[model samples]
Target: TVAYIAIGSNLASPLEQVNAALKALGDIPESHILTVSSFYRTPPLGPQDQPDYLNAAVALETSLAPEELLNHTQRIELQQGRVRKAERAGPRTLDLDIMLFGNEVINTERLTVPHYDMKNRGFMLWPLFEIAPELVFPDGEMLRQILHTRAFDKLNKW
Candidate 1:
């Protein structure tokens, strides 16, 4: 099945952190890294005190189950020096979120697919549309509709 992952970094060399994370994703067993969107500079989602984040979306074909895939991504973050903070949405060396897992709408204690905030975040939507314009939600919604909305008007490509 195909998985869409959202990647971001706002600490240290953000671009290099993202680049290294991308390589780590490619190295995951039972998976093949498909494509990655160009990195874009975006304002931080929380705590405005931090540096802007460099973000991108990655597509992968994997045989691992959702939880297993989640484990792999978390390991990549830790290996990249990501430290969890008490503050939510705080700065990080790397942030890897599972945006979608195939067409499955997963709502579990450990994970959420079609990430809870994806639809409302231009940082997620724009880069996602860049590589998967025709993507449709498991519920039949189209990605381009959100991509064209004025909600994302302020997004700047980096």
Candidate 2:
């Protein structure tokens, strides 16, 4: 199955952090890293003392179940300094969010696929569309349709 992940970093050299995290993601057991979207820049979601975030999307083919894949991604987050700089008001080192797990709609205690608020996030949508322009929701909604109503002019391409 194919898994889509969102990678974001804003602390301790956002570019390097994302680069390292992407490498680590490729090393997960039972998964084969496929493609990566171009990196993008966006200011922090809310007003706070923090640098802008660099974001990208990764698509990987994995034989592992969603929960199992979630485990590996979380470990990558921790390995990249998420725990040390995890405070909400402070900068974040790395963020690996599962955006989609094959066409599955998963809403469990531990995870949510198609990430709850992805539709409104340019950082998420833009990179995602770059890699999976023909992607459709489980309900049959197309990604380009969502992009039609939203503009990501503020997001800097890299």
Q: Compute each candidate's TM-score over C-alphas.
A: 0.89, 0.90
lDDT of each: 0.85, 0.87
Whose lDDT is greatest here?
2
User: lDDT by residue for model 2 over 59-101, one digit each (tens)?
Assistant: 9999999999999998888778567646565544678999999
Question: Clash totals for all models, in order?
Answer: 0, 0
Candidate 2 ranges with C-alpha deviation above 4 Å: 45-49, 85-91, 151-153
lDDT of 1 by residue, 1-158 (tens): 99999998887787778888888999999998889998888875577556887889999999999999999998988888556442245434678999999999999989988799899988888899998999999888899986666466376767
Candidate that would win on TM-score: 2
lDDT of candidate 1 vs native? 0.85
What's model 2's lDDT at 82? 68
